């Protein structure tokens, strides 16, 4: 529901990201329903899962290398995480592959935290990830139809591209 400007964009995004990161952290191929993101949530969660897994599984060695290199364990670490995420777009090129990589990275860290039973840090992490990720790309996301444009881009293989 529109209250300020792009309130809907944040909620839909947060729900999907929170769901995706928490889901993957369990280690199983589960998929829980959204409370607000019905159409966008299911379309985006399904795509984000397929893409997020493909990205992190392919560059798994690189992800794990950074995962072991990262000293992330508390709420203070999110400052660096948010900085790294925005740093990826420092050249001004907001490519989807970079955006999803940051999400797959978040999921990778979510799993790392869940593996040691530190869910208490996963919630604030997923929140910071969604907040900073969207905050620094508001206009770009709203102009790109949000998750609608996101799913279509990764569906050009053989689903809804042509």
């Amino acid at each position: 529901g529109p209250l300020g400007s792009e309130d809907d964009l944040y909620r839909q995004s947060l729900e999907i990201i929170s769901r995706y990161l928490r889901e993957q952290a369990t280690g199983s191929k589960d998929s829980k329903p959204l409370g607000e993101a019905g159409a966008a949530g299911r379309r985006a969660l399904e795509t984000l899962r397929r893409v997020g897994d493909g990205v992190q599984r392919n560059h798994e060695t690189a992800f794990q290398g950074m995962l072991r290199k990262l000293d992330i364990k508390n709420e203070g670490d999110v400052k660096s995480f948010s900085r790294v995420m925005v740093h990826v777009f420092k050249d001004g090129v907001t490519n989807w592959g970079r955006i999803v990589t940051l999400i797959s990275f978040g999921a990778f860290v979510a799993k790392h935290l869940k593996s040691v039973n530190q869910e208490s840090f996963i919630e604030p992490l997923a929140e910071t990830i969604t907040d900073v990720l969207v905050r620094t790309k508001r206009d770009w996301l709203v102009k790109q139809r949000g998750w609608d444009g996101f799913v279509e881009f990764f569906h050009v293989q053989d689903l809804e591209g042509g």
Binding site: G97, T101, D158
Partner: peptide, 27 residues
């Protein structure tokens, strides 16, 4: 006990390659 900004570069390079991999279909 420190944050070496290699993740930023690594993730950046990964994103570029990933984007180029998803944009180009099996054609």
């Amino acid at each position: 006990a420190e944050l070496p900004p290699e993740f930023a570069a690594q993730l950046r390079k990964i994103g570029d390659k990933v984007y180029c991999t998803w944009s180009a279909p099996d054609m």
